[PDB]
Amino acid sequence: YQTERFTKFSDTLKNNEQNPIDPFNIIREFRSAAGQLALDLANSGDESNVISSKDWELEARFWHLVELLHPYNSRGLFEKKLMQDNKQLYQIWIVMVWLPKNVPTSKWLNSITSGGLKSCDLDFPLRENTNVLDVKDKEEDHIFFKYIYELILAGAIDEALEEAKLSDNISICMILCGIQEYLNPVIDTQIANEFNTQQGIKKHSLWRRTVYSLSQQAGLDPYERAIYSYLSGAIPNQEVLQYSDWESDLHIHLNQILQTEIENYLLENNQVGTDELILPLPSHALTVQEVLNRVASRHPSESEHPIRVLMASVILDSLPSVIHSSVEGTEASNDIIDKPYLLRIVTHLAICLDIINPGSVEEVDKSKLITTYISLLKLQGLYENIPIYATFLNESDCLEACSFILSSLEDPQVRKKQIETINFLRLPASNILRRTTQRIDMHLIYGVEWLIEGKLYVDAVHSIIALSRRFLLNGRVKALEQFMERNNIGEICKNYENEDQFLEEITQYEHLIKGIREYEEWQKSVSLLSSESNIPTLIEKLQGFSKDTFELIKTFLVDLTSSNFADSADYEILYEIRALYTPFLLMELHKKLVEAAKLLKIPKFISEALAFTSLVANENDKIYLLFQSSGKLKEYLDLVARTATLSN
Amino acid sequence: DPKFVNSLLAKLKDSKKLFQKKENLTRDETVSLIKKYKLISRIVEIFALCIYNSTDSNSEILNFLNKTFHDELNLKFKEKGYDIPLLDIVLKADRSWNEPSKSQTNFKEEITDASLNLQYVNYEISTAKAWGALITTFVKRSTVPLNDGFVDLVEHFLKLNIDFGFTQIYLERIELSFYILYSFKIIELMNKIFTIFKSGELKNNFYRPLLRSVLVLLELVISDQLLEFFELVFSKGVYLILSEQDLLLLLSLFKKITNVNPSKNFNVILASSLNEVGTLKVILNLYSSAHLIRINDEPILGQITLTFISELCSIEPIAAKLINSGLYSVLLESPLSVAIQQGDIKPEFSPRLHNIWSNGLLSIVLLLLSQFGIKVLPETCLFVSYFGKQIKSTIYNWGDNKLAVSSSLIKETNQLVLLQKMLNLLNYQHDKKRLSAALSKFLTHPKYLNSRIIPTTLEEQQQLERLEFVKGISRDIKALQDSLF
């Protein structure tokens, strides 16, 4: 459940804004969310929400667990070069390492008095009974060693030294200074400078095979020795277990894989000899994946946690193989459906990992996983994350599926994701855009809705009026109704007189149309009627009206002004309209006086199809440069003479 | 957050220099004071809550002397003060005993003052200029004779303007006075501009506090100060537009000059003082064709110069000071001949020149015939000749179908017919019948009426965003047809 978990991991992926990103942050945002979910149901809620919060504590841990000379040397520089010149062993070491008492000290009083003691040391304990000294520090060899077993997988041994020293031990704590290799200004040259004195043991391999004899010593009870196993590489002696789970096995496992193989490596560098053991050395190299099959069969109690399976696979370093088993699973089967965090958490990482390493996510397994997530979002009853996860979707799968999701229109930030699956999946004139009311330039009608909000409010009213004049020449005043109710309100300075000449550009277009229109009702009402009963005062006026409406007295069809926004296609377009329609009306106006029943507003007699000449000479529409100097203008003196004799 | 208020409920009324006698800006007395201006901070945050319930509703908002709001019987403008250095060359050998030890403590006390004045100043700023806010909201709430305690307090704060005469906090004594006699000061205070200001006009690169100040200083209820100050402002004020795009606040400060201690009937000496100087008659040329200063002629220039000649032509002497020195001039100096010489100035194509020729340029010349004009006679005949083409078109143009007309153009012909009427009466030493026919024709035809006349300018669309548009058109044709022969 926790649909708050989903929001908290889908915002990080992207407030879905576009900026440069380094996708390490998206792991950190994921960890920050994981801790806080893991708290908010781990102290309120029921108790199944404490297991839900236990799972999310695993998720945190795993996102923690992705991250984490030459010439003659001691054993110290060998070990450094080892870790230098491989990085799968260096990581293996980092895994096993990653996850208060008050004691007055002293002994040896009470021991001599009852019986024998005879020599002071905790080696008296080892010649015979471990009851021979004080028995409330026999207590401490169990108990403070138990604290030490939590500590060593919390890292370090010098931590464990400081607690060994409170354990009333002061010569059995020398064994934890023994674990140091020789670091010296006599035999190292880059460890001769952070130390100016001798450190560790240069018989560190005879130390290792002698602290390994104690790991099997049968006078030593398990609550001492289990750390002596571990100091020479960990045999699983059951008190290096305190968590006993999948990862507690694996730490002690991996400890022994490195501890066999360092002696081998030191047989190349020759720190192993025949004076360097009391017990013959295990020069068998140990394999990671096979000891994981031991672990896997041992704990089918951690096969139910898929996150614990994600944890395993990064130490394998086999990320495509897990990601391909968690979508279909294996091969066309359902078996990935029985953990409820499998299909979620491995979905999130498939996205975010593909941007880190793009061989690491197969990229087909991303595709299948976000589809699986989107169907489960369909069944959630969410529908404002089905956009967010179908950006990553492709036109091959879920074309029309996303069409019909994105049919409903909603919240501003969600419209930004809408656009980025609409025009991403290339659907512009399908059946998104009519299932908005029920439920190629169609989408320009629908693409002037997106501009009202900020950050594209400065580009808003600019593009609106552009798209008006683009499909006003083509023609579509029904659709011009839908750029003028999808019109941005603001266009002043604080949006950015600006744009308010366009208001009048529509109005001088109607002065042009009426002029074209009035030639129809001329052939009807004038030129087929030639009778009188007070009909002169009705048909002779109609002819006059059309003469008064075909030029704007100031200037017709010119604009270039400052109440117009910048562009020279607001000047040209008016010019191109002017030259195509202005001689069309002069051809119309010429037959309105020569073929009409009444030739003027006098039935006979003509003078005013010879005063067209003055009407091209006028600068009310400047029709003296709209007829070119020769071949048009010359032939036009022929034209009004031609029609002056068309009255006859 | 954190916020800059903090400490304690109102019920304390001091942080004077009276209680803590003038021994200040160096010592513990001042320290009580600066943390007292933290007090007054939280008290006036509390009084912001009283303005948010001035809006909503509250029992007896006014309360003086809710909470009482009188609590400063002096405001301090004393740190703008006290010199800190040049007690410190004495310091350079002092120390030998306990009279030195007294000395040395007074100068260490001023290394304390060096912190404390910075604090002080931020905090009296938060204090005082918000006290004024509170005062003003009390005034716009219903008047009481406790907003005359406002008179009692403002008076003590223009006499504590003087101690100097900085000036960018001097407004806590001007504009408070302004709310009093606006809803319903001190001659002395208002002299301060004629004292300080005078060193120029150019070197308005630090004159912005003076302008702010001056504005609200002009409020008084003629000033001899007024004639003097005026020779520099909006005589030589406006010169700088020929020494530059014309600018808002010149013509606005003119409006404040109009409203000051009586100038209403002194219109004669204002017009004279303006006429003597050659300016205020150079700017006319900008609308003609701007290039006097090499600023390229854009019709945006006209939009502001319009408001200028408008605010002039109201006042009949200031109107007349212009006709001779040439308006008939400016018309003849015209930039375009496709937009002032055609028969009807159309909203289509450039409604800039369309707003201009309607509002001004007709109503100005009419007013000049509203005096039962006897002076303007040849100039106005000449001006019917000039636009002879427009007189015959504005009659003729209309059929009973004539689209591409606006309410604006109707106004222009109201203007035009009104002018020809007065011209004929007022000399005392025709085809209008056409437009009477046309208008009846559209009257009896409501459909052609409503349809042909259409909105074009931005203004007009808002005239349909109640349909006050038609309302305008009715009262229009009333007066138009009344004046028409």
Coordinates of N, CA and C in Angstrom, one line a residue, chain A residues 491 497 500-501 503-504 507-508 510-511 514 517-518 521 541-542 545 548-549 551-555 558-563 619-620 622, chain B residues 298 300 337-339 342-353 393 396-397 399-404 441 452 454-458:
Chain A
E491 N -1.7 40.9 -22.5 CA -1.0 41.2 -23.7 C -0.5 42.7 -23.6
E497 N 1.4 48.4 -25.7 CA -0.2 48.4 -25.6 C 0.1 47.0 -26.1
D500 N -3.6 44.9 -30.2 CA -4.9 45.5 -30.1 C -5.1 46.3 -31.3
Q501 N -4.3 46.0 -32.4 CA -4.5 46.5 -33.8 C -5.2 45.3 -34.5
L503 N -7.6 43.6 -33.4 CA -9.0 43.7 -33.1 C -9.8 44.4 -34.3
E504 N -9.1 45.4 -34.9 CA -9.5 46.2 -36.0 C -9.1 45.5 -37.3
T507 N -12.2 43.7 -38.3 CA -13.2 44.6 -38.7 C -13.0 45.2 -40.1
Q508 N -11.7 45.4 -40.6 CA -11.6 46.0 -41.9 C -11.7 44.8 -43.0
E510 N -14.4 42.6 -42.7 CA -15.8 42.8 -42.9 C -16.3 43.9 -43.8
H511 N -15.5 45.1 -43.9 CA -15.7 46.2 -44.8 C -15.4 45.7 -46.2
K514 N -18.6 42.9 -47.3 CA -19.9 43.5 -47.6 C -19.8 44.0 -49.0
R517 N -20.5 41.2 -51.3 CA -21.7 40.6 -51.0 C -22.7 41.4 -51.7
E518 N -22.5 42.8 -51.7 CA -23.6 43.6 -52.2 C -23.9 43.5 -53.8
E521 N -27.3 40.9 -54.5 CA -28.5 41.6 -54.2 C -28.7 42.8 -55.2
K541 N -31.2 53.7 -54.5 CA -30.4 53.9 -53.3 C -29.4 52.8 -52.9
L542 N -29.7 51.5 -53.3 CA -29.0 50.2 -53.1 C -27.7 50.3 -53.8
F545 N -25.3 52.8 -51.9 CA -24.7 52.2 -50.7 C -23.5 51.4 -50.9
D548 N -20.4 53.4 -51.3 CA -19.9 54.0 -50.1 C -19.2 53.1 -49.2
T549 N -19.1 51.8 -49.6 CA -18.4 50.7 -48.8 C -17.6 49.8 -49.7
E551 N -13.8 51.1 -49.7 CA -12.5 51.7 -49.4 C -12.8 52.2 -48.0
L552 N -11.7 52.2 -47.2 CA -11.7 52.9 -45.9 C -11.0 54.2 -46.2
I553 N -11.7 55.3 -45.9 CA -11.5 56.6 -46.2 C -10.0 57.1 -45.7
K554 N -9.6 56.7 -44.5 CA -8.3 56.9 -43.9 C -7.3 56.1 -44.8
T555 N -6.8 54.9 -44.3 CA -6.2 53.9 -45.2 C -6.7 52.5 -45.1
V558 N -3.7 48.3 -44.4 CA -2.3 48.6 -44.2 C -2.3 48.6 -42.7
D559 N -1.1 48.0 -42.2 CA -0.8 47.9 -40.8 C 0.6 47.6 -40.7
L560 N 1.2 48.2 -39.7 CA 2.7 48.1 -39.5 C 2.9 48.8 -38.2
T561 N 1.9 49.1 -37.5 CA 1.9 49.9 -36.3 C 2.5 49.4 -35.0
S562 N 2.4 50.2 -33.9 CA 3.0 49.9 -32.6 C 2.0 49.4 -31.6
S563 N 0.7 49.3 -32.1 CA -0.4 48.7 -31.5 C -0.5 47.3 -32.1
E619 N -5.6 58.1 -52.6 CA -4.7 57.4 -51.6 C -5.5 56.9 -50.4
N620 N -6.8 56.7 -50.6 CA -7.7 56.1 -49.6 C -7.4 54.6 -49.5
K622 N -4.9 53.7 -52.1 CA -3.7 53.9 -53.0 C -3.6 52.9 -54.1
Chain B
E298 N 7.4 58.6 -33.5 CA 6.6 57.4 -33.3 C 5.4 58.0 -32.7
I300 N 3.4 57.0 -30.5 CA 3.4 56.8 -29.1 C 3.6 58.2 -28.4
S337 N -0.2 62.3 -44.1 CA -1.2 63.0 -44.9 C -2.2 61.9 -45.4
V338 N -2.1 60.7 -44.7 CA -2.9 59.6 -45.0 C -3.7 59.3 -43.7
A339 N -3.8 60.2 -42.7 CA -4.2 59.9 -41.4 C -4.5 61.2 -40.7
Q342 N -7.2 62.6 -44.8 CA -8.3 61.8 -45.4 C -9.7 62.2 -44.8
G343 N -10.9 61.9 -45.3 CA -12.1 62.4 -45.0 C -12.6 62.0 -43.5
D344 N -12.3 60.7 -43.1 CA -12.8 60.1 -41.9 C -11.6 59.4 -41.5
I345 N -11.2 59.6 -40.2 CA -10.1 59.0 -39.5 C -10.8 57.8 -38.9
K346 N -10.2 56.6 -39.3 CA -10.8 55.3 -39.2 C -10.0 54.6 -38.1
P347 N -10.6 53.8 -37.2 CA -9.9 53.1 -36.3 C -9.0 52.0 -36.8
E348 N -9.4 51.5 -38.0 CA -8.6 50.5 -38.8 C -7.6 51.3 -39.4
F349 N -6.4 50.7 -39.2 CA -5.1 51.3 -39.5 C -4.9 52.4 -38.3
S350 N -3.9 52.1 -37.5 CA -3.4 53.0 -36.5 C -4.5 53.6 -35.6
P351 N -5.1 53.0 -34.5 CA -6.2 53.8 -33.8 C -5.5 54.8 -32.8
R352 N -4.2 54.9 -32.9 CA -3.4 55.9 -32.2 C -3.9 57.3 -32.7
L353 N -3.8 57.6 -34.0 CA -4.1 58.9 -34.5 C -5.6 59.1 -34.4
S393 N -17.0 64.8 -46.5 CA -17.1 63.3 -46.3 C -17.9 62.9 -45.0
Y396 N -21.5 63.0 -46.0 CA -21.8 62.1 -47.2 C -21.7 60.7 -46.8
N397 N -20.6 60.2 -46.2 CA -20.0 58.8 -46.0 C -21.0 57.7 -45.7
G399 N -24.2 55.8 -45.9 CA -25.5 55.4 -46.4 C -26.3 54.9 -45.2
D400 N -27.2 53.9 -45.5 CA -28.0 53.2 -44.5 C -27.4 51.8 -44.3
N401 N -26.2 51.6 -45.0 CA -25.3 50.5 -44.7 C -24.0 51.2 -44.9
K402 N -23.1 51.0 -43.9 CA -21.9 51.7 -43.8 C -21.3 51.0 -42.6
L403 N -20.5 50.0 -42.8 CA -19.8 49.2 -41.8 C -18.5 49.9 -41.7
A404 N -17.8 49.6 -40.6 CA -16.5 50.0 -40.3 C -16.3 51.4 -39.7
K441 N -32.9 57.0 -40.9 CA -32.8 55.7 -41.6 C -32.2 54.6 -40.7
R452 N -24.2 47.5 -38.1 CA -23.1 48.3 -38.8 C -22.1 48.9 -37.9
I454 N -19.9 48.9 -34.7 CA -19.2 47.6 -34.2 C -18.1 48.1 -33.3
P455 N -17.4 47.3 -32.5 CA -16.4 47.7 -31.7 C -15.1 47.5 -32.5
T456 N -14.0 48.3 -32.3 CA -12.7 48.1 -33.0 C -11.6 48.3 -32.0
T457 N -11.4 49.4 -31.3 CA -10.5 49.6 -30.2 C -10.7 48.8 -29.1
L458 N -9.6 48.6 -28.3 CA -9.7 47.7 -27.1 C -10.7 48.1 -26.1

